[PDB]
Symmetry: D2
Subunit: 237 residues, 4 copies
């Protein structure tokens, strides 16, 4: 099994699995059934930005999603990641379409991991930032239908020349280098991530959503995880 | 007097005003009667470190103090600075003594403050990092008995030529340029400071402590803010 | 008088004082008479980016001005800045108009000074970055006609409500906190600034220029510096 | 074979292959016979720090080695890396011993690279810093005798239980994720590296040196590259 911690930008409400009756953002801890969600006003065609922050001091994961001139959705969950994650992990973005479809384009992405110790002045860290992706983005592990290059953007799910988004698609893109998310001697551990997304659909309701996840190094897309499972979890439990 | 928000490293328990019967950590908002406290196994003679963090997402101010190969004190508090501070401020370090003394020596200090806008790539930030203080540190506003140069350190309170601390002393150090702590359009607003220190004393009980405060641009040690008032508040009311 | 070092984005050619027969970029080591220049193909109305860098290992000052969809004009000179500037200085922007005029709008400004001492890795550093300029910017010393808050940009020179520039104008913008540009116990000294400008002129003869400058803490607009002197020098010597 | 561009801290004078009569810092381009060098007052048994720097503006590679309060060696060379290195590479350290020995301890390492493209306000960048090497450092490709964890340091070559160094050893350490060292659209490409070391030989005649190299993704220790070849080049041709 895989250990998954993630913030989901869910566009399609699957009321049957406890989804709110509207698009939303939520914190997923080892399950597709969000521990805490927040109403989100999905804007079709408009480029949204999403900022996620976390630190072991207050032990609280938070996510803010905003569109220029428009409001912002926020959500926070009290979680001690050191109990719910391997010491080493791999960070990345996931997205998927199902019966309904949408474009899950990632215009940019940046991440910052920071491990401060008890020993004065000793600190380990990692940070990367992409403002444009290359066809051969040699530092991202592409998985599924994820492809880089087109217009310098990262397409997490299948699209066509018409610009049309294909249904039943699923893709993931995660940074090559393993992230050292925590440790015992660390007095303060905290990570921060930011990405800009572009989502638009031709049909009545877009689906299914983009998500930022943290997982163990060898994580591979679970069998039949398109649609409601956002390409992250193997079952809707 | 004016507005002050601070995290205090209180080494001497002043019961009459609210100090618990032990050296502690605490969040101070517009008053010297802490909103939150946490025991702190003060290590006399040792070099300690402190980390202060805040962000408008979850909206909590928290601090952590540690010593190499030892425990770590922690304290957080819910506070929306938007309702407690002027949009523009100055940040600094304070210290003091009275009947009993101690050395409030700061070995290094750093600070970072960012303002993430609602519009993509609109981020305003400021960050300085003092790892070595000089005889004429032109970018700091030294107040009270604060001096620079001694071993490249920053002495907040008076120290005798041989090194011995001196009672009834009050000093301060404010970075020169004003900091734009918050803004109404900012989607995310945060800051974080860090400093290593040395609190050494001869007598049975060191006093009074060290503190990181944030106040309005124009600010100086309030009349009579010696000892238990840490040089931050004009009174204990 | 004031000790100045500047990178000049010269739009109007003042052949009479050494200006090449075409708009250009040049390095000024204490005189308006550039120590070296390179042809700059201006792009009236296009937002461009300026990149300036320097380190004490090479003693070479370098600048690069580029536009989207076009080649860039690079320029570099060997100048031991510690043998020209004080240990502490002030960084800022300057712009002026003469008979003919233009808009010297600054969209964003960023700067970073890193002074790495000789001790292990005890580094000192300052970094500010603006991507949005507020109406009352308590951290910027405005001089001359320089205004802010206009579209969240910085207006170095004069402009009328209808976005029409004015002539015989001069304005400067200086960062508040002094900058310790050089130490003598540091193994490596380095700095860099980047700004994005928007120059639009109606009279088919844009004048006069923009310039990044480093000066003495108390620097100020010289008299009659408007026009060909870019509000930086008192004469064309 | 592999394409190597390295900065060598050559402790042993192999006159037979161009090494000066004294220890030195040299710049190696697709060869072990340095293009340029400089005398190095190697201080047997004391922590030192090397600092590499390079940028595309003035296309120059420089290095500075220094021990606390002592001689500061320096060496530079003009080289357009984009015409020598693959658009994608890997970075890492390397050290070795032969008939003579020495401890090749790295106590910390940091790297940072940025790519400012023609695209206004859009950058790409990678930065990592290690102040402590974990027993199981999952983001480094240890080759040869390279081992981390011991004393929280990183041992590039063989070191006996009693601490004594061993002869005829070679080790490497390359960061896991590939580094997009350059790209056409980039108006300004530039990296920076910084690392502290502790070379000590229990006598007076040490050898053979350490080196910071940039190589093609799949570089492996050449056969017989011990000692004078520093585990970087297949032949001292
Ligand atoms: O509107 N409907 O009646 C309706 C249509 C489809 C539906 O589920 C299907 O499509 C979703 C959207 O792609 C997926 O999340 C889900 O995995 C898949 O089973 C549920 C209800
Ligand atoms: O021993 N005692 O009982 C005793 C000693 C001192 C005392 O207060 C005095 O010294 C403190 C420590 O310097 C200050 O915080 C305080 O402002 C000042 O009034 C109170 C009681
Ligand atoms: O027609 N002309 O040949 C002619 C006209 C004006 C002129 O100078 C005046 O206007 C310039 C552009 O605003 C300034 O650079 C200069 O400082 C100012 O004195 C020079 C030549
Ligand atoms: O006795 N000596 O002084 C003496 C010692 C060693 C020597 O060369 C040998 O050892 C070097 C140092 O390990 C290697 O770099 C070199 O590859 C190998 O041939 C030459 C003379
Ligand atoms: Ca759903
Ligand atoms: Ca007290
Ligand atoms: Ca001119
Ligand atoms: Ca040699
Ligand atoms: Mn959901
Ligand atoms: Mn107290
Ligand atoms: Mn000129
Ligand atoms: Mn050599």
């Amino acid at each position: 099994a895989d250990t998954i911690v993630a913030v989901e930008l869910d566009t399609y409400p699957n009321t049957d699995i406890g989804d709110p009756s509207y698009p939303h953002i939520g914190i997923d801890i080892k399950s597709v059934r969000s521990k805490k969600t927040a109403k989100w006003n999905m804007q079709n065609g408009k480029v949204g930005t999403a900022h996620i922050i976390y630190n072991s001091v207050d032990k609280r994961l938070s996510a803010v999603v905003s569109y220029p001139n428009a409001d912002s959705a926020t959500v926070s969950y009290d979680v001690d990641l050191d109990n719910v994650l391997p010491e080493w992990v791999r960070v990345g973005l996931s997205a998927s379409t199902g019966l309904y479809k949408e474009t899950n384009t990632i215009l940019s992405w940046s991440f910052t991991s920071k491990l401060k110790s008890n020993s004065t002045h000793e600190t380990n860290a990692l940070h990367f930032m992409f403002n444009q992706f290359s066809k051969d983005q040699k530092d991202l592990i592409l998985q599924g239908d994820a492809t880089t290059g087109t217009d310098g953007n990262l397409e997490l799910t299948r699209v066509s020349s018409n610009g049309s988004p294909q249904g039943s698609s699923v893709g993931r893109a995660l940074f090559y280098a393993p992230v050292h998310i925590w440790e015992s001697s660390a007095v303060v551990a905290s990570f921060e991530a930011t990405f800009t997304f572009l989502i638009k659909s031709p049909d009545s309701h877009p689906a299914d959503g983009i998500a930022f996840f943290i997982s163990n190094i060898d994580s591979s897309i679970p069998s039949g995880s398109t649609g409601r499972l956002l390409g992250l979890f193997p079952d809707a439990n």
